[PDB]
Structure 1
């Protein structure tokens, strides 16, 4: 049995939506014809740590063979998009840099890096900036909560 995957839209609680720029994932207020730039996600339900509440997922940009991943860059956990080979990915046992623990509270989602615990997927308050990770979700004005809608 292949890994379970479902296509979805994910957007932040400030209503920013995701799109690609200069091959970085960015969040902004797409409007008019640009709304068609919105990137849908393939969410795969991967192997990860047993948990009462968290659900391990990998997040790929639909049909692009590009996965969100977490790596150290200048000694700081950092979000980067990694190209993957569709002959091998997604799969049940994905490498830990690709795994996020999906956390649902009040039907909003947070995505915690499994590689770097306590670092969460985030967007800036400013539009059209790269998506990032933060371990200080409750400082400043970064956004770490998301809505989602499965599509098909």
Structure 2
């Protein structure tokens, strides 16, 4: 491959897992046969900052060609899923909207938007709400820490 890419499962530190509702990524709690609804991710090692703290990554939905991306919506950094052409994606130089700086401390992961520094991938306190981005990860408004498990 022209990009190093790994299958994983990602869950937040409130034990919520991701799934699709309409066409949006939400976070919640699944039981029994509903665990089928869980989305796995393909995590690619893309180019960006060269640091001992951060590894730039893009996050795709396993086998659906949907990428997590940070875009301005009404003057506010917003997480949106983007359909990509499998013919070109994933690649080493992903556009900056797809790029997250993965930061790992103590088995927990934060994903900072490359495009929007100081803004972090996050989920709400309540179940079943869309995944989002926030620039206030130090107040316990949103959840901005995650665990991951590589499944390849």
Using the size of structure 2 for normalisation, the TM-score is 0.98
- Tell which deviates more after alignment, 45-54 or 9-18: 45-54
Shift, 1:51, TM fit:
1.2
Aligned-partner Cα distance in 1 for 2:82–2:120:
18
Aligned-partner Cα distance in 2 for 1:72–1:18:
22
Identify unmatched segments of 5+ residues in structure 2.
none
SS in 2 for 1:149: strand
Q: What corresponds to 1:2 in structure 2?
A: 2
Using the size of structure 1 for normalisation, the TM-score is 0.98
Alignment of 1:1-152 (within 5 A): 1-152=1-152
Shift, 1:2, TM fit:
1.6
SS in 1 for 2:92: coil
SS in 1 for 2:118: coil
- Structure 1 residue ranges, 4+ long, deviating more than 2 angstroms after superposition: none
Query: What does the per-residue CA deviation read over 1:113-148, in whole Å, with 9 as the maximum and x for residues that have no partner?
Result: 000001000000100000000000122431000000
Query: What does the per-residue CA deviation read over 1:54-106, in whole Å, with 9 as the maximum and x for residues that have no partner?
Result: 00000000000000000000111000000000000000000000000000011
Shift, 1:28, TM fit:
0.1
Aligned-partner Cα distance in 1 for 2:137–2:20:
24
Identify unmatched segments of 5+ residues in structure 1.
none
Matched residue pairs, number?
152
